[PDB]
């Protein structure tokens, strides 16, 4: 019912000597113009 997205290694990671051997990755997300909701829901969790 739902779609899937994944990240794969196309090639190996190469780094020059004298540089850190690993890094960290971050990502951003948003909504497009044509995105909208239809009907309200009475949802609450905390507290």
């Amino acid at each position: 019912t739902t779609g899937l997205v994944s990240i794969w290694y196309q090639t190996n990671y190469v780094v020059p000597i004298g540089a850190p051997n690993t890094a960290y990755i971050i990502a951003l997300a948003a909504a497009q113009k044509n995105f909208t909701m239809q009907l309200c829901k009475d949802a609450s969790d905390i507290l």
Partner: protein
């Protein structure tokens, strides 16, 4: 043009090289084929590929190209070699039309039967040259540059492109019956690097043919 989540990061500054100053011809498309990454090592001697028989397994339209007989397309071949700014190496890319694979006939008796199927099928990954000086065919490696080629230097560039039209043995050509061409990649100066650095150099090759033909016959 994405298969689910296939949106790779691609270069926008390719070095445009034309072949004989001639664009391809009509009957005589946006899918970018992706191959597995190649690892370049200090003791590596270079690889080779055979088209279109091996090409019919990597591409999305290549997989369907197994069942397509004829071709009508223009080839834009992209070879990509990413590396750091302090790495050392040199690579040669060239295309050899009508590249006949040279079988090796060793042993005490210089005679062999029809070429074995093991030698004819190296797989979709590719094979390594036994003696890359003769391209495993008795053909000197010094003379490749007469054919279309491109110089790849780590200090100079990271990518290259080759464009070649269809050249066949007959005016009426068959792609699944007649082997067209192949690609040759061989190091000229062995790669060197400092101790502890990354010892693997990635190689990727990208091509984008337009379309093929089904054909078919009945009795």
């Amino acid at each position: 043009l994405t298969i689910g989540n296939s949106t790779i990061t691609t270069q926008e500054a390719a070095n445009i090289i034309v072949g004989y100053g001639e664009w391809p011809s009509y009957c005589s498309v946006n899918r970018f084929y992706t191959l597995d990454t190649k690892l370049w090592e200090k003791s590596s001697k270079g690889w080779y590929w055979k088209f279109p028989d091996v090409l019919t397994e990597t591409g999305v339209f290549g997989q369907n190209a197994q069942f397509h007989y004829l071709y009508r397309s223009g080839f834009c071949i992209h070879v990509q070699c990413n590396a750091s700014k302090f790495h050392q190496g040199a690579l040669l890319v060239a295309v050899l039309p009508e590249y006949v694979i040279g079988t090796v006939a060793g042993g005490t008796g210089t005679e062999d039967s029809h070429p074995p199927y093991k030698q004819t099928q190296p797989g979709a990954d590719g094979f390594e040259l036994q003696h890359p000086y003769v391209l495993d065919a008795g053909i000197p490696i010094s003379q490749l540059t007469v054919c279309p080629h491109q110089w790849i230097n780590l200090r100079t560039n990271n990518c290259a492109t080759i464009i070649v039209p269809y050249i066949n043995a007959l005016p009426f050509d068959s792609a699944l019956n007649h082997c067209n061409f192949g690609l040759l990649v061989v190091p000229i100066s062995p790669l060197d690097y400092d101790q502890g650095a990354t010892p693997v150099i990635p190689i990727t090759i990208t091509l984008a043919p337009m379309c093929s033909e089904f054909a078919g016959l009945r009795q």
